[PDB]
Amino acid sequence: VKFSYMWTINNFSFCREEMGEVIKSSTFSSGANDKLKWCLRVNPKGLDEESKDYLSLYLLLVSCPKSEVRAKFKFSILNAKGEETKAMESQRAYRFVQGKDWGFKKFIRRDFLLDEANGLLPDDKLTLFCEVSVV
């Protein structure tokens, strides 16, 4: 079962969040009968000291009807040219339980994201995509 989600964070260059602080997306679902609910969590200034130079990006399982979900996922960024870039995928399915996340503590360097030459914050918005695949 596939899930796709697009998240636009407005005014991203002005986030006040300090290292360790998190912004959470709305939930998304398959639209089908599996009852699974997901959301994204980003740390604009990284999860922790080790990752302070990075944006940290995670997929969170918000609800599932039984105990565990195995899912593959992929995150990418929309650029100013209208294309998905910097996509990274889980190389395998990971085991999710309700309230548990998986993702990339070092998803993209902040100094790359903020360099206008890379076009990743058009109109100062960060647009992220997430694809989820559940067995």
Binding site: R41, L47, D53, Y54, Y58, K86, M88, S90, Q91, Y94, K100, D101, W102, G103, F104, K105, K106, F107, I108, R109, F112
Partner: peptide, 14 residues
């Protein structure tokens, strides 16, 4: 330096 633009390692925040 270990300053790649991205790192592909998957982890969980717990």
């Amino acid at each position: 330096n270990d300053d790649d633009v991205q790192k592909a390692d998957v982890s969980s925040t717990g």
